[PDB]
Design a protein around this ligand. Sequence first.
Ligand SMILES: Nc1ncnc2c1ncn2[C@@H]1O[C@H](COP(=O)(O)OP(=O)(O)O)[C@@H](O)[C@H]1O
Ligand SMILES: Nc1ccn([C@@H]2O[C@H](COP(=O)(O)O)[C@@H](O)[C@H]2O)c(=O)n1
Ligand SMILES: [Mg+2]
Length: 194
Amino acid sequence: MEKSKPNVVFVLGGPGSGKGTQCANIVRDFGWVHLSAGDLLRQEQQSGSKDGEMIATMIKNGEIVPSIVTVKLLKNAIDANQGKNFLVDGFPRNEENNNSWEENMKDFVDTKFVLFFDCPEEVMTQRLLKRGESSGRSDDNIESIKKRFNTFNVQTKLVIDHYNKFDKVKIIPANRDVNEVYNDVENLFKSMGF
Ligand SMILES: Nc1ncnc2c1ncn2[C@@H]1O[C@H](COP(=O)(O)OP(=O)(O)O)[C@@H](O)[C@H]1O
Ligand SMILES: Nc1ccn([C@@H]2O[C@H](COP(=O)(O)O)[C@@H](O)[C@H]2O)c(=O)n1
Ligand SMILES: [Mg+2]
């Protein structure tokens, strides 16, 4: 008769590994709320806050924005959606992200696991150049794309390694057709009781 705290699943994977694509399917079939941290950041810069032109520059360069900004945006969205569960997509991307989540949120949510989509960089590059023909995203060009790989490699893989220490990573290989990947995603969420 108390309201349950939201379940949260971090969704990680390289740029273009299919996080946003698979999250939309989970929203559709499970009724979770999909929060793409990168999306929220693109919105925050959209209508031009203080932090707006900082976010533009860092996104173009594949850099991780200060966590005070990102975690605030996530927390606001989450607080606006009482009684829902959340797919937190593309976060945490480094140790600062994770610590700031822990400090702001751990009292408020049950973060269940990291869903990690494993994909070859070569395949990710091709998807992103394809997405780049119509996305109008400032980071879907080869210069940005390789900077995004280095950030993922240097900062993000350590976070995924951290969660795997505690058995909190579910890996779904993503180098297949989108329905073959989703079949596995949908089976995973069902087996996890969602
Ligand atoms: N399994 C897949 N096979 C081929 N294309 C895919 C697959 N998953 C997603 N895509 C395409 O790859 C691009 C990147 O997908 P997206 O979900 O935006 O990635 P992410 O959020 O991980 O950066 C999009 O054009 C998307 O339609
Ligand atoms: N936790 C996060 C998530 C996204 N980002 C920024 O948004 C950019 C785009 O992220 P997405 O590909 O997940 O939309 C990232 O490359 C990075 O510059 C961030 O700075 N912090
Ligand atoms: Mg995305």
